[PDB]
Design a binder for this molecule. Structure first.
Ligand code: NI
Ligand code: NI
Lengths: 385, 400
């Protein structure tokens, strides 16, 4: 595969002579040392979720290159698939989905807000590892973060901000004309298909375990909603093992729940394969995605839907999101009231510079999107309490 | 010997023993707790451990390039990763302040010490297995013995003074079985030399000497950047303390580059400061080699350590001393530790007043079982030792 997929947007820095690491190992190190990644500890934290996703992602790849050796060379290296799972959630705003909706509404006339768009914007521009190119990651890694590789102009709509079109053009630059015109038509790269599967499996299964010990789900509710749906989900392993897994998850002993969680995770990984994308792509990274076997896919959706209605769709969480979304709107209206006097001094400078292109609002949105919940509340207390 | 890959206790899992140790540590509750221990600063013990791990793998890469003789002996990436991810697992709430309190409250029951606690967590407390903690491979455990002696080998009397109750360093006597297991494939001559004192132990394995250097480099440099932007050190204090001492430290690179390094650190631009940090880190890494240990050790993991070049050692010691003088030994940090040590001592005295009634039920049950051996206090100590600051603050409020 083309060495253009290993390239960075800028070559000003020179790799040290003693440094024999791959471009993707350097990408992983950049993300791990970045302020955006460290913030995931505030946001079982988002950093914990991303570490689990990285381990599943490398487990998926290891499993695929055993069942399909022909693709051993095509598949992402361990440090690349790690990089996409450590970076995938850096763009989420304070207060999760409540934060996203507020920011999107406050930007309704200036490009909106969306978390995956924000991830792309952080790594290509906001993280100041370089002065002008963010973390300046290699092209293939950047392509792996484009879960929706079209512009938003084409709840927020998934896409890339128009203010980042230059860096999106750079990422897709080595693709032939027709591959680019299919991409905007729903479509994603192989590496990103793997990262997505790792993220869902981690969400479905690893949120579930401490939901049990915290008492947020009792055995009756697991049997009534998840365990019954899985006995009829159509995959033979789950229909066979569901009863035995339900007793391990409610064992009350960690060394038994761990065997259940490990068994569920492993069953999902072994049901993933590379199949051809069903469209006339020429580039191998868009012609193939990783897919989970459909029945095993049904079981994953039972786990995802179950964790969402008993961990997320409960009033204690939903009231916190309502608070968060009111709180974010308060900050946005105050800061845009007089940005130059209320923003931190450095952010005020970027706002002045950004106003020559009438992008002052995107700067305020960047600033809020990068706050933790503790930072936003304290800022809210400084402006209103 | 393959005995170093053995544990105390799937078809498609073709990972090395050290890759499995890394995954266990990454998944452990003990590791996740390091995230807890108006700006946007989020440097934790967890981030400190990731940076140490990345320096550790870089150290191994430099040794395998300059000293091929040692390529079979040096630790794999995941083994050095595992030792840096775990090195800070045993630290109690409130850092040294917590440690002083627990040690004083355990004065008659084996004491408390963070490295001992780290050994105790991975060999027993973390409930990944029923009876052997994370059940790590023998060589990984050996890499964690920064002080491979018992606290019986390594009393103060008489408001509390920090100097009087800083713990000796070593392994708890109640974990002797798991220590005996780790040292089992050693000849008697290596074993009686390993517990030799300089009381302060003198020796450690090659894997652990590498982790110690990576930890020391991480502590020295990666605290330094945020100290500068938070205003905890001014340009003037950097010149008088660090820069002047580095101009006379004896290493030519630092004497040559200090002037330009100081202007880059105070540039005010992250993309410039990182190049100073990267160059300091790289200058330190590239100055490490494996040499023989000055003791007639027979086992190769004990006959060789990694050492930093001495003049380079002075530069590292200037940086470590500087972060201690302007980031740690400041009244703002020390009062937080005094408060924490008063807090830890309150929890211990209340909980030991009646453990069955006040402990959470699961910990109360462990306390009852442990009283058959009269080791109840260590159970209270493990419980307090595994709290975060926030959990301890909440428990304290429920009690006072
Ligand atoms: Ni995610
Ligand atoms: Ni450390």
């Amino acid at each position: 595969l083309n060495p253009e997929w290993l390239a960075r947007n800028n070559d000003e820095h020179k790799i040290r002579r003693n440094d024999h690491r791959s471009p993707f190992q350097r990408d992983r190190a950049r993300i791990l040392h970045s302020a955006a990644f460290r913030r995931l500890q505030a946001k079982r934290t988002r950093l914990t979720h991303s570490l689990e996703a990285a381990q599943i992602g490398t487990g998926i790849v290891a499993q695929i290159k055993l069942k399909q050796p022909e693709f051993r060379e095509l598949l992402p290296s361990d440090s690349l698939i790690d990089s996409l799972c450590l970076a995938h959630d850096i763009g989420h705003p304070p207060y999760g989905h409540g934060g996203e909706i507020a920011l999107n509404y406050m930007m309704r006339d200036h490009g909106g807000f969306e978390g995956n768009a924000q991830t792309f914007r952080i790594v290509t521009s906001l993280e100041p590892y370089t002065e002008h190119h963010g973390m300046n990651l290699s092209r293939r890694t950047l392509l792996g973060l484009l879960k929706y590789p079209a512009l938003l102009s084409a709840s927020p709509a998934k896409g890339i901000y128009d203010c980042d079109l230059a860096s999106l053009d750079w990422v897709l630059e080595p693709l032939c004309e027709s591959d680019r015109e299919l991409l905007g038509q729903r479509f994603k790269s192989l590496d990103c298909s793997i990262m997505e599967l790792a993220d869902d499996i981690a969400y479905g299964v690893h949120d579930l375990e401490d939901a049990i010990v915290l008492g947020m789900v009792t055995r009756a509710q697991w049997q009534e909603a998840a365990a019954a749906q899985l006995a009829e989900c159509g995959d033979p392993w789950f229909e066979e093992h569901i009863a035995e897994l339900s007793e391990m998850l409610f064992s009350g002993k960690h060394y038994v729940r761990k065997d259940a969680i490990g068994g569920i995770v492993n069953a999902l990984l072994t049901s993933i394969s590379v199949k051809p994308v069903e469209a006339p792509f020429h580039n191998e990274l868009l012609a193939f995605n990783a897919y989970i076997e459909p029945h095993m896919g049904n079981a994953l959706e039972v786990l995802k839907h179950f964790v969402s209605q008993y961990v997320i769709q409960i009033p204690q969480v939903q009231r916190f999101e309502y608070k968060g979304q009111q709180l974010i709107m308060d900050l946005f209206e105050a800061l845009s009231a007089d940005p130059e006097r209320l923003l931190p001094q450095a952010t005020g400078e970027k706002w002045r510079k950004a106003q020559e292109q009438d992008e002052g609002m995107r700067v305020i949105c960047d600033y809020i999107a990068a706050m933790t919940d503790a930072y936003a509340q304290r800022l809210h207390q400084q402006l209103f309490s």
